[PDB]
Amino acid sequence: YARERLGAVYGFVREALQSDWLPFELLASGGQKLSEDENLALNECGLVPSALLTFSWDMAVLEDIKAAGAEPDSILKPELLSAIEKLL
Amino acid sequence: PNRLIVDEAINEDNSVVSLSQPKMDELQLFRGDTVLLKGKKRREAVCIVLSDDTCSDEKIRMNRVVRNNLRVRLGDVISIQPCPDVKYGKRIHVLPIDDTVEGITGNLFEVYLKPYFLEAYRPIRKGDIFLVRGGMRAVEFKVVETDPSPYCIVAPDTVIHCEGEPIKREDEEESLNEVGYDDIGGCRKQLAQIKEMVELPLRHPALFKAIGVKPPRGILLYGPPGTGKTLIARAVANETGAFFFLINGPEIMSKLAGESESNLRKAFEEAEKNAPAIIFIDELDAIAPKREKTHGEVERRIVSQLLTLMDGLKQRAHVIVMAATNRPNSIDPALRRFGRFDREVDIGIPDATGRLEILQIHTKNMKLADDVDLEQVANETHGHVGADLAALCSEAALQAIRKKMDLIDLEDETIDAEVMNSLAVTMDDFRWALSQSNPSALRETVVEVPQVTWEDIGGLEDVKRELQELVQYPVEHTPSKGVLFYGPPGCGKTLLAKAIANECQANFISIKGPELLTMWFGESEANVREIFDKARQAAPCVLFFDELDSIAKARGGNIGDGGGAADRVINQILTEMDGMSTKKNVFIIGATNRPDIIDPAILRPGRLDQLIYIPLPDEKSRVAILKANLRKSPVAKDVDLEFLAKMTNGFSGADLTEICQRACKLAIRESIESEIVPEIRRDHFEEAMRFARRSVSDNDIRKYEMFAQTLQ
Amino acid sequence: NGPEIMSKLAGESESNLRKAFEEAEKNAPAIIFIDELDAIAPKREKTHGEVERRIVSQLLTLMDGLKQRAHVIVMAATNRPNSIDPALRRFGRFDREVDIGIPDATGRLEILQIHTKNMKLADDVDLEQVANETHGHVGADLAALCSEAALQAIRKKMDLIDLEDETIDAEVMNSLAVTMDDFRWALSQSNPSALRETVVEVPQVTWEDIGGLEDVKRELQELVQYPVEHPDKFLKFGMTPSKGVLFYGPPGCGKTLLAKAIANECQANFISIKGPELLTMWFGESEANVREIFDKARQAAPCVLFFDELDSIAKARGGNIGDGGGAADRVINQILTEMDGMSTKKNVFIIGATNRPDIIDPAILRPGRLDQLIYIPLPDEKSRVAILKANLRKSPVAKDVDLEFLAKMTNGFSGADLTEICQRACKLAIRESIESEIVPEIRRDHFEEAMRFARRSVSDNDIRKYEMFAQTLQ
Ligand SMILES: Nc1ncnc2c1ncn2[C@@H]1O[C@H](COP(=O)(O)OP(=O)(O)O)[C@@H](O)[C@H]1O
Ligand SMILES: Nc1ncnc2c1ncn2[C@@H]1O[C@H](COP(=O)(O)OP(=O)(O)O)[C@@H](O)[C@H]1O
Ligand SMILES: Nc1ncnc2c1ncn2[C@@H]1O[C@H](COP(=O)(O)OP(=O)(O)O)[C@@H](O)[C@H]1O
C-alpha cells in the first residue's frame, strides 16, 4: 500500500532472505537510510509509486562474516530463487 | 520514442536525473533504478533516475556535469535505456584534473573522493568527469580505470585508488568552473526572457537562414553595477556554445582616433567568422554616450561606427549583440531605434529570496558551521547586489582563514587539503563581514514582493474580496486596471495594496509623497516614465501612488499658489496610464486623504474606474486589529482585547497600533529592570490608554462620508 | 546614409558626400537618397563639432549646386521633420516634403495582401482580421508576419517531404497553403515598432454606428460639408464659415464617433490629439509642437483635427483652484495663433471635446475658433434602444430579448455602457456556441447574465453638473 509502514518492508525482505534473523539495513534511492522501528509511511519517505532500495547487511555481522572467511554469495532463500525470472 | 529533451536540473547532485513519473511508468523503471543516457558523438553516461512534481512530461532534467559527459546542451535530445544489469564495482581508479588541482596538496581521497562515494552508491563509468566540492575549491576528477566495464556502482567494499600525476584537460572537455545558468541566483524571469529571444537562433541557426526575417539584433541589459548583466550574457553563450566576444567602453575609448574605430569594427568581423556568436558591450554609456553631451570627435565617430555595425548584422548571420548600461536613458537614443537595440531587460536588485540563492551559489565550495543561517544574512543584506554578496562571502572566508591559519602554521607554495577541509565559516565571520561590507546599491529603489499578507489587516473583509475579484476576474473569465482608495488616515490603505501584491506574489512599488514632491520641485517629472517602465518590467506588480494630493498641498492645498489640483507629476502619470493595457499585468492603486481636491481626471473612464471607501474600523474589526498587532508577542490571559475595542470607539487602526506598541514598550522596561514579566499584561495596556488618542475627529469622518455619498 | 558618412574621418566624410553628387550628374537623370538626414545634417545650433558644422555646410552648397546638375533630384528621409537644420528646408534645396507616417487600417490590409501575392492562403485566413489586430505595426512588421506565416507552413509540411537542400519540386510548393494558425503564431512573435506614434487615417465610422443624436449629425454636416458643397450661398449672404465646434457633456456618449462619422462621409483624415499631448508640451516647454499638430492637419487635408480633453490646459493651471489669473498660457496661446492663421480653403475642420466645459479658456469660443457649442447628453429612452440595436447588428438576436425593456431600466447608462452590455452578451452567446461542439442567436439569458457585470460609468451628481451647465448657457 502507498500508506504502508517501513516495518512491513523489512518483514517482507526477512521472509525472502535465506536467513530471516540476520540484521540488515535498507537504503532508499535519495540517500536516506530507512529505520525498521520507525513509524513512517512509504508515501511519506518517497518510495511511491515505485522505488529501488539498496540492501546491505548490518556492520556487526559483516565484521564476523569477513573475519570468518565466509563469502556472502547467497542473499535470498532457495525457495524463492528456484522461481527466478529473467528480464528482457 | 524513449527519448526526451534535455532541461535544467532541480537536484544539483551529479549522479541523478529527474523524469516526469508517466515516462518512468512507460519505461518501467523505478525511483533509484540505474539507467544509461545516450548522447551525441557515440557517448553515454550512467546515472540514477528519480521523479518530481515539476519536470515536463517530455523532458529530462540533468545538471551541467551530466550534460558535459554526454556532450549535449539544453534543448538537445537523448535516449534513456535502463540498465538493471549494472553490478557493484571492485576497483575504480580516479585521478584529478590538473586545471583544478593547482596550489592544493595533501590526500585528495580522504578529503574529496572518500566522503563523496562513501555509502553513496553512485553509478560510475570509465571516462566520466565528476565534481566534488569542498575546502573552498572545486576539484573535478576523471575516471581512468574500472575493474568491471564499462560501468558499475561504487560500494563500501569497492577499492578507490588514486595514484599518478593530475590529468591534463583535453581540448574537447569544458571546465566545470565556467559560469553557466547554475551560477545565476535571482532574476530568473529576466534570464527566461533572454532564453526566449536568444537560444533559438543560436541552437538552431538553420531556421533563420531560410527566411528574410531576422531575429532580434541587440538586447540592452540595464540596472545597477554588480547585478549580473555580464554574468547572464556569458552564461547564455557558454550554455548554447556561441562564441563570446567581450567589449567595453574604456577598452575602445582608451585608444587613439582610427585605432579606436578599427578595434570596434574588427571585433564585429571576428564574430561573423566565429558565428554563431554573442558580442557583449559593457558600459554602453561610455562607448556610446549621448552625442549632444560631448564635443570630442572620437566619441561622436565611435557612436556613428557602432550604429553602422549594428545595421550590418543583417549580413552577419547568427551574430547577436548585447549591451550593458546603468540606465536606458544614459545612452545615445539612436541605438534604441527600431532594430539595433530595441529590446530592453531590467535586471534590478535581488530581493531577499534572490539574495539567499546568490549566497548559496557563492558558498558552493565553502564549509559552513552548523550555526550559519544564510536566510538571516539575506534578510539583513538590504541594498546589496550579487557583486556585494560575492565580496561578503569572500570576506567572511578570509576572516575564518586568518583565525584557523594562525593555528595551522603552514607556510609553503601549496596548502594541505586536510587543513582546508577542517576550515569552516561561522556566523561570527559572516556578521563581521556584514559590518565591514557596504552595499553598492543602497540609494537605488528596491522593488520586491511585500511580506504583508491579509492576516495582517484587521477588518475590511469586503474590501479584501473586492481586490481579489479585481485581480482574479480578468484572469479567470474592459476590466478596470486601477482603484483609488479614500477615507481617514491610518485605516490600512497601504496595507491593502501590499496584501494583494503579497498573495499574488507580485512586486510592490511604493511611490510616496516625498518622491512625488521631489519630481515636481526639481522639474524632473519625466522620471514618471521610468517609474511606469519599472512597473512594466517588474510585472506582475502593484504600482501604488500614495498621497496623490501631496503636491496640491505643497502648493497650498486649501489656499493655493500658481496651481490647483493638477501638477507636473500627476499629468505625466495620466500620460502613461492612457497607454497601458490590461494585459500588462500591472495593477495601479492610488490613495488620498483629501479626495475632494484630487484631479478628477484620474477617475475618468479607462483609468482609476474603481473607488473603495475605507472607513474607521467597527468594534469587531478593532478587536481583529489588536489581535493582529499582538500576533508577534506573548500576551497575558488577563488582557481583555474586546474591552479595549469597546472603549476605543473613535480610534483608527494606526491608533490601536500605538496602544499596542506603548504596552510593549512598558513590557520591555519591566523586563529589563526586573532582570537587573515575560508577557504583556493588562497593566501595560491600561497605562497605554492614558496617552493614546483618536487621530481622526468626528467632523473629519463626516467629510469622508459626504464624499462617499456624492459618488456612491 | 547619415551614420556611414559620419563614421568617416574629417575630410573623408565631405569628399564622399561630394562624390555622390558628382556621380549623379554623370549618370543623370538620377535620384540621390540621403537616409537619416538628421544624422548627416543635424541642427548646427544643436551640435558642437567643427566637422558636423562643416558637413552641414557641404550639403547645403551641394543642394544649391543642383541648379547646374541637370536632372538630379535629391530625396531625404528623417524620423521628424524638425530634427534637421532649418537651412535645408529653405526655398530651393528641400522645398518639398511629404509626411508618410504610419499605414492606416486599410493600408495595413493592403500591405498584407502585397506581401502575400505569391502565397497560397487557406480558406480560414482572414487578412482583414489581422490588419485590425496589428495595431502599431508598420510595413516592416507586416512583411515579417507574412514571411513567418509562410515559413510555418513550410516547416509543417515540406520538412516531412524534402531534405535540407536548395531545390524543391514545383508541385510540392504549389500544394502548400498557409493557415490562419500560422498567421496568428507570427502575430504572437512580432512586436509593433510604432505603437506610440499618432496614426492619422480616414475613419471607418459612419452615421449608422451612432445611436441617437439625430440633430447633431445634421448640425455637423451644416458646419463641415455646406461651406464647400455650396460656397456660392455663403458668399451671397456674407457668411463666415465656422472653423470648428466644441463638444461638451458626460463621457461615453459618442463624441469621438461624431467627429469620425463626419470625417468618414467627407472622406477626410481623422487626427486624434489627446490631453497628454497638450500637457506634455506645456510642462516640457515644447509648445512649438503645437505647430507640428496643425501642420499635420494642413498636410493631411482634407482632415478633421480632433482635440480631446480640451480642459487639460485649464486643469494644468489648477482647474478647480489655480491662481488668481485666467486660463491663458503658453500652449493655448500657440493653439489660438495657429487657428487664426489657418485658412478655410485648406479643408481643415477642428473639433474639440471636454468633460469640464466650465473651465475652458473663453478665448477658444470667440469667432474664428471653436465658437459653436453642442451639448451631448446621456442618451434618452429612444436613443438607448437605438444604441443597443446598432451594436447588435453583427449578431442575431433572439425573439425573447426585450431591448426596449433594457433601455428603460438602464437609465443611468451611457452609450459606452450599453455597448459593453451588447458585446458581453455576444461573447456569452459565442461561449455557448463553442461549447456545444465539445447558439445561432443571443438568448435572453445571455443579456440577463451580461447585466450582472455591466455598470453605469456616469454618476448622478456628474449628470446634474452637465445639465446645469447646459441650462446656464440657455
Ligand atoms: N544575479 C546574480 N547571481 C549570481 N551571482 C551574481 C549575480 N550578480 C552578480 N553576481 C556575482 O557578482 C560578480 C559580478 O561581477 P562581473 O563579472 O563584473 O559582473 P557585473 O559587474 O556585470 O555584475 C560575479 O562574481 C557574479 O558571480
Ligand atoms: N486595518 C488595519 N489593521 C491592522 N493594522 C492597521 C490597520 N490600519 C492601520 N493599521 C496600522 O497603522 C499603521 C499604518 O498603516 P498604513 O496602511 O501605512 O496607513 P496609511 O495607508 O494611512 O499610510 C500600520 O503599521 C498598522 O499597524
Ligand atoms: N451614441 C452612441 N452610439 C453608439 N455607441 C456609443 C455611443 N456613445 C458611446 N458609444 C460607445 O462608447 C465607446 C466610447 O465612445 P467615446 O466617444 O470614445 O467616449 P469618450 O471619447 O468620451 O471616452 C465607443 O467605442 C462607442 O462604441
Author numbering:
A (entry chain G): 354 to 441
B (entry chain F): 23 to 499, 509 to 707, 728 to 763
C (entry chain A): 270 to 707, 728 to 763
Paper text:
During 3D classification, additional structures with different UBXD1 configurations were identified. Two additional states were identified, termed p97–UBXD1meta and p97–UBXD1para, in which densities for the VIM, PUB, lariat and UBX are also observed at other positions (across P2–P3 or P3–P4, respectively) in the p97 hexamer in conformations similar to p97–UBXD1closed, indicating that other configurations can occur.
p97, also known as valosin-containing protein, is an essential cytosolic AAA+ (ATPases associated with diverse cellular activities) hexamer that unfolds substrate polypeptides to support protein homeostasis and macromolecular disassembly. p97 forms homohexamers that enclose a central channel through which substrates are translocated and unfolded; each protomer consists of two AAA+ ATPase domains (D1 and D2), an N-terminal domain (NTD) and an unstructured C-terminal tail. Here we identify UBXD1 as a potent p97 ATPase inhibitor and report structures of intact human p97–UBXD1 complexes that reveal extensive UBXD1 contacts across p97 and an asymmetric remodeling of the hexamer.
